[PDB]
Design a protein around this ligand. Structure first.
Ligand SMILES: [Cl-]
Ligand SMILES: [Cs+]
Lengths: 256, 394
């Protein structure tokens, strides 16, 4: 399977960038979370970035911290998340699915065993938020052995050695956080990095259009989707309608 | 990539979001050069001596060992400015900050003792200080919060998660990832991502250096065992470090057993937890079978850390140090015994170490043995806690 390459191939013949929502699995419940994901896909999401609720997400802001708590309140566990992942994949065979993990959940039952389970349910990539490239050797080797693409964040304070490493070790796409952007995009293209998705503060259509214009292959909406869920917790049918409105607005912005 | 090994055996590492690595790399480099700088060591030792009160006494207990062949000494870190050993390392981290040209200090606290230590070093040395605290811990420790405010520090409550220490450790780190140009993260124990387990040990090691010189002066021989409680591991590794190569000296760390290991309500990850990756390190920790991270429990809030410094996990695995647990009740009894027989009120944290020494002595009263307990703090902060239990019992 190589869903990212196929996705980026068709996106480029159609001169579009990718729009990628992030959402916490099981937020606010298991069944509402599955309807949210089906809504995001049918409103035009090109791929999905899914979080597994973890007790101590030191790499996440408050919006996500509360999503995790909503999911834990709902009783969501990693095992249930993997069951959810198999259902999603069964309904949507071609959309790429990336997980945003914390290291302890990957380490818990064995690193190889975790990446085996990802391949079994048809997950395409894994970002481990608290494993820098310097520590990533056991993680990305397990990922490659199980045909999982390892995703690395390229931060604003990245020097050249970091970009070289990110370009060699990552697959699928590069998680870009915001030195100038166009220069960062260009250095990554020089080093043959996976296509770069911009993932900092992507809240409006004009930001989606900016990133594609700046040379990025697309944009990840890191939390703007979780706030629509938070805003509309009491009216689930309002929540879906505004999710559909937002996503199709953001995805229209990617056709430059 | 780093100047020093970030691992002790298989434990340790730098498990942080990519964005925080330059902060850690900059901190390691400044620490390495400060360690080679006579001027830094002189300013450090000056503050420890003329401001904090070092060297601390080494007290021979007169009455507590009567009727046995145990000789017991207490390293008196309760006599340190602030009442606890924490003061040593925050003075060092604040000099480090200034040496880096930083002007702001970030810290996390639970019981409040690390917050107070950070606020006092920050006031002395001209740093702006902001402290994160779990809102549960905030009102449970409003005396310490008032202290921090009196010393000029900004106290910021955390409600995220369980609103305790571990959720305080998380929000300080997000602050630092944005502010590390101007601000320094003053981590409160000998754990977390490298270089912090190394830095805190080196800024606490004078405890064991002094103890060694004092015991040789007074008894002419090294002790049979030195004993310290182990919340995160800083006071214990500060006592241990200078003896690690004197292989005839036992190293004994005492984890809080809470209501008892078999009850699951304890704070003993090193012997009763399981290796995982959290807070920037690979180490034993309190975690669920799914891999979520649980809270410690101990009657002493200062041993509330659900993991343990990685060097302690290393020393255990190679068998150089031994780790035991002591329950709430055992520590309470040791607290009462020290007050009544020596006129010293120990911190309930330190009481866990003492409680194990009393066990060694009482189980084998004819065994000749020379024991040093690190009295990591005084117990004024704990009289209210001990009072309520004692009248709730009778
Ligand atoms: Cl003195
Ligand atoms: Cs502990």
């Amino acid at each position: 399977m190589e869903r990212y390459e196929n996705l980026f191939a068709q996106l480029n013949d159609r001169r579009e960038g990718a729009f990628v929502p992030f959402v916490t699995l099981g937020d606010p419940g298991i069944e509402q979370s599955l309807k949210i994901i089906d809504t995001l896909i049918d409103a035009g999401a090109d791929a999905l970035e899914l979080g597994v609720p973890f007790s101590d997400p030191l790499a996440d802001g408050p919006t996500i911290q509360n999503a995790n708590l909503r999911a834990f309140a709902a009783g969501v566990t990693p095992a249930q998340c993997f069951e959810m992942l198999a259902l999603i994949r069964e309904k949507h065979p071609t959309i790429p699915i990336g997980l945003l993990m914390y290291a302890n959940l990957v380490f818990n039952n064995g690193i190889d065993a975790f990446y085996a389970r990802c391949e079994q349910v048809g997950v395409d990539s894994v970002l481990v938020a608290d494993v820098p490239v310097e520590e990533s050797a056991p993680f990305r080797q397990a990922a490659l052995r199980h045909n999982i693409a390892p995703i690395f964040i390229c931060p604003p304070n990245a020097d050249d050695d970091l970009l070289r490493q990110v370009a060699s070790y990552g697959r699928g796409y590069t998680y870009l956080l915001s030195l100038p952007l166009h220069h960062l995009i260009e250095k990554l293209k020089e080093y043959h990095a996976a296509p770069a998705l911009q993932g900092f503060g992507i809240s409006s259509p004009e930001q989606v259009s900016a990133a594609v214009r700046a040379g990025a292959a697309g944009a990840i909406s890191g939390s703007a989707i979780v706030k629509i869920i938070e805003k509309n917790l009491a009216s689930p049918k309002q929540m879906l309608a505004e999710l559909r409105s937002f996503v199709s607005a953001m995805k229209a912005a990617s056709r430059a | 990539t780093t100047l020093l090994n970030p691992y002790f055996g298989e434990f340790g590492g730098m498990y942080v979001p990519q964005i925080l690595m330059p902060a850690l790399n900059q901190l390691e480099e400044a620490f390495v050069s400060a360690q080679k700088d006579p001027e830094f060591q002189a300013q450090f030792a000056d503050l420890l001596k003329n401001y904090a009160g070092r060297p601390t006494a080494l007290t021979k207990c007169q009455n507590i060992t009567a009727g046995t062949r145990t000789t017991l000494y207490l390293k008196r870190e309760d006599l340190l400015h602030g009442g606890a050993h924490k003061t040593n390392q925050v003075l060092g981290q604040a000099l480090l900050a200034k040496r880096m040209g930083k002007s702001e200090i970030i810290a996390e606290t639970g019981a409040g003792q690390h917050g107070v230590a950070s606020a006092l070093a920050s006031a002395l040395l001209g740093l702006k200080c902001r402290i994160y605290m779990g809102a549960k811990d905030v009102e449970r420790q409003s005396p310490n919060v008032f202290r921090m405010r009196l010393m000029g520090a900004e106290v910021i409550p955390v409600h995220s998660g369980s609103a305790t220490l571990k959720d305080a450790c998380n929000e300080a780190l997000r602050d630092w990832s944005g502010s590390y140009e101007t601000a320094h993260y003053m981590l409160g124990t000998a754990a977390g991502p490298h270089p912090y387990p190394t830095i805190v040990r080196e800024f606490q090691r004078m405890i064991g250096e002094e103890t060694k010189a004092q015991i040789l002066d007074k008894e002419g021989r090294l002790p049979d065992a030195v004993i310290a409680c182990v919340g995160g591991g800083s006071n214990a590794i500060g006592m241990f470090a200078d003896f690690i190569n004197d292989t005839s000296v036992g190293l004994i760390g005492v984890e809080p057993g809470g209501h008892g290991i078999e009850t699951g309500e304890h704070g003993a990850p090193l012997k009763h937890g399981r290796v995982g990756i959290y807070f920037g390190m690979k180490a034993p920790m309190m975690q669920t079978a799914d891999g979520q991270i649980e809270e410690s429990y101990s009657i002493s809030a200062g041993l509330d850390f659900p993991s343990v410094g990685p060097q302690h996990a290393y020393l255990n695995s190679i068998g150089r140090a031994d780790y035991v647990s002591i329950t709430d009740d055992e520590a309470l009894e040791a607290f009462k015994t020290l007050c009544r027989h020596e006129g010293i009120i120990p911190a309930l944290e330190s009481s866990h170490a003492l409680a194990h020494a009393l066990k060694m002595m009482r189980e084998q009263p004819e065994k000749e043995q020379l024991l040093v307990v690190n009295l990591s703090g005084r117990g004024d902060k704990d009289i209210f806690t001990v009072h309520d239990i004692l009248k709730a019992r009778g």
